[PDB]
Design an enzyme around this catalytic site. Sequence first.
Site, PDB file in Angstrom:
ATOM      1  N   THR A 140       0.843  -1.178   0.000  1.00  0.00           N
ATOM      2  CA  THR A 140       0.000   0.000   0.000  1.00  0.00           C
ATOM      3  C   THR A 140       0.889   1.241   0.000  1.00  0.00           C
ATOM      4  O   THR A 140       2.113   1.164   0.152  1.00  0.00           O
ATOM      5  CB  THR A 140      -0.999   0.003   1.186  1.00  0.00           C
ATOM      6  OG1 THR A 140      -0.309   0.153   2.440  1.00  0.00           O
ATOM      7  CG2 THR A 140      -1.847  -1.276   1.182  1.00  0.00           C
ATOM      8  N   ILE A 186       8.030  -1.270   6.564  1.00  0.00           N
ATOM      9  CA  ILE A 186       7.681   0.135   6.670  1.00  0.00           C
ATOM     10  C   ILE A 186       8.263   0.843   5.460  1.00  0.00           C
ATOM     11  O   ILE A 186       9.456   0.741   5.177  1.00  0.00           O
ATOM     12  CB  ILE A 186       8.191   0.778   7.965  1.00  0.00           C
ATOM     13  CG1 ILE A 186       7.591   0.063   9.185  1.00  0.00           C
ATOM     14  CG2 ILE A 186       7.892   2.270   7.947  1.00  0.00           C
ATOM     15  CD1 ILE A 186       6.086   0.035   9.262  1.00  0.00           C
ATOM     16  N   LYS A 187       7.399   1.549   4.743  1.00  0.00           N
ATOM     17  CA  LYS A 187       7.781   2.190   3.490  1.00  0.00           C
ATOM     18  C   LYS A 187       8.113   3.661   3.719  1.00  0.00           C
ATOM     19  O   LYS A 187       7.368   4.377   4.363  1.00  0.00           O
ATOM     20  CB  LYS A 187       6.645   1.966   2.492  1.00  0.00           C
ATOM     21  CG  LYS A 187       6.832   2.308   1.070  1.00  0.00           C
ATOM     22  CD  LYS A 187       5.630   1.647   0.330  1.00  0.00           C
ATOM     23  CE  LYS A 187       5.647   1.899  -1.084  1.00  0.00           C
ATOM     24  NZ  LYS A 187       4.481   1.236  -1.661  1.00  0.00           N
ATOM     25  N   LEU A 188       9.258   4.080   3.180  1.00  0.00           N
ATOM     26  CA  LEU A 188       9.811   5.436   3.331  1.00  0.00           C
ATOM     27  C   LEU A 188      10.266   5.903   1.954  1.00  0.00           C
ATOM     28  O   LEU A 188      10.852   5.117   1.215  1.00  0.00           O
ATOM     29  CB  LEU A 188      11.030   5.454   4.280  1.00  0.00           C
ATOM     30  CG  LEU A 188      10.824   4.982   5.722  1.00  0.00           C
ATOM     31  CD1 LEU A 188      11.242   3.547   5.841  1.00  0.00           C
ATOM     32  CD2 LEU A 188      11.623   5.845   6.698  1.00  0.00           C
ATOM     33  N   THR A 233       3.455  -0.755   4.524  1.00  0.00           N
ATOM     34  CA  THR A 233       2.686   0.387   5.000  1.00  0.00           C
ATOM     35  C   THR A 233       3.603   1.597   5.047  1.00  0.00           C
ATOM     36  O   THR A 233       4.659   1.566   5.682  1.00  0.00           O
ATOM     37  CB  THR A 233       2.094   0.119   6.394  1.00  0.00           C
ATOM     38  OG1 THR A 233       1.247  -1.040   6.330  1.00  0.00           O
ATOM     39  CG2 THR A 233       1.296   1.326   6.910  1.00  0.00           C
TER      40      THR A 233
END
EC number: 2.2.1.2
Lengths: 316, 316
Positions: free
Chosen positions: A33, A130-132, A94
């Site tokens: 996502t 965890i998306k950055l 996310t």
Amino acid sequence: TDKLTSLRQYTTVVADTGDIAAMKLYQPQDATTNPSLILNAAQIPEYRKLIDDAVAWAKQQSNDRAQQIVDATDKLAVNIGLEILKLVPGRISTEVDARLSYDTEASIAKAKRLIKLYNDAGISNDRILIKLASTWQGIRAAEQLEKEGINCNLTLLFSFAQARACAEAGVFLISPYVGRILDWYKANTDKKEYAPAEDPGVVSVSEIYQYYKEHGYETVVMGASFRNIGEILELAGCDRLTIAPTLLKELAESEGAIERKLSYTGEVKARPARITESEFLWQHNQDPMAVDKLAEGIRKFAIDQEKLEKMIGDLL
Amino acid sequence: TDKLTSLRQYTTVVADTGDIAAMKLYQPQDATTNPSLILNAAQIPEYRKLIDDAVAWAKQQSNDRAQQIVDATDKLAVNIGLEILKLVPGRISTEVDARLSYDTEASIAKAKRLIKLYNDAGISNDRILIKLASTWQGIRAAEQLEKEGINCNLTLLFSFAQARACAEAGVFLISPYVGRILDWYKANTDKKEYAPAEDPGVVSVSEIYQYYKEHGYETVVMGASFRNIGEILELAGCDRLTIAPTLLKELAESEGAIERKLSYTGEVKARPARITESEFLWQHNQDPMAVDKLAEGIRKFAIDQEKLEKMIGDLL
């Protein structure tokens, strides 16, 4: 005898959507996502319960409007992730609030906060990315997060400087973009049509893949952002590919076995000294496409975050 | 009267060129050069003696080809400035190697090197502005340089974040761009003709001027980069304006008095806390024009530096 099945021989297929219907239909290994997809998913009438749960949860955490907005929006993103985790065997990605993209400290804190929400819901770190955004600050955040056992997905990756810095940071996974690179080249060069092997997004991911495998880096290469099936087929063999439902449909509807196109064969090479921040900034800014598209992607995700906060604020 | 004479009532007029003929003709108060102008001036046959002196000087400093290239190119830039300083009563601006634009310490070192060459040639710091691209790293370099008694000209200034950070750093002078902003808006919107007051470059400098004066900042505001004289006239009242000979000629040939258009009237206000690096990066990257044009201007000046080095290398 369809191309989706054929692709899965070579590449781990990931679904790029917040819609659980796609997970049931295509049975992907992982899902991704991002803030735009969270906002889109929040429009699904059937997801109203997830929004209501997020708001109810937020109101148990504090009596403060500002914090309730942050808490409900974060919990909504996690709630959607939790629903997807019931339907895939692998990871959910996310993404942190894109407004934090140039703030390493705030990005680390947000990543830990999202991990806490998942952990408290019974999900271990081995199921979460965890998306950055892969700004220098995001890459530095990710390096610290990995040291603390939080696996990251470094996204909006356009320049070679970004690719190199992510590998050197030892991040779990990168999401180098394909389709948005095609968009930029159509808009900013005189070549308006591209054969699959000419597609500059395909070239980008192919070059990144080669660099990673040639130096023995273990960061997962996951191509992302697609305009057409030709791009995907040209990257068959990429470690993972995250694909929107419309193109998963096209792959599933297309008959014919495909060949692996993306492989590494060669002598693995010694690594260079780490790229410094100054060298990174110089080299990133040598790439006008990457300059534009990294900054643009961050702005767009920030606008989607603000739209989510407005939606939540209206329910408090 | 003519418009150049009339403009000079309100604004200090500066010549944007390395050509001494313009200094003799227009008798400007200051002059500005940049790496493109240095390359162009180096190609004027009558300037060959300045190149020969620079090369002769470089060969006195070391017996190393790589260092001779750097020394000769630096000395050439200074030699051109020295010629201009014989013909103007005010400042010369001399720009550091644009390849250093994301490296604070290398930028400080280069600024000090150029200052040493000027000082050794009998010129005091009060006649020199060292020009740096207004990246965060350049602004930090300039903050240090000013504290050591070296006055700076912060250039390629496009975003409000750049403007604010430069004021807060206490830099001597900024060169916010006008014409390149117009270029970007013509390319990226459907509006290609603007009344002078709606020209987005004019709006940028006007807003920066207002912010500076409203907060009592002493940094000189010098509009730079012009496409037409309407832009210049709309900024009449700006502290300084640096103008190419082509437009100085147009102003001198245009009849009639002009009015002062840019002034501050109001209650001077308290300053905010300083913008942090993270806030600066966020706010700069909110401005897609500035994102593109800052990076582009640095790239172009770096190419000019490389062309200069090729010219010099062939003479060693």
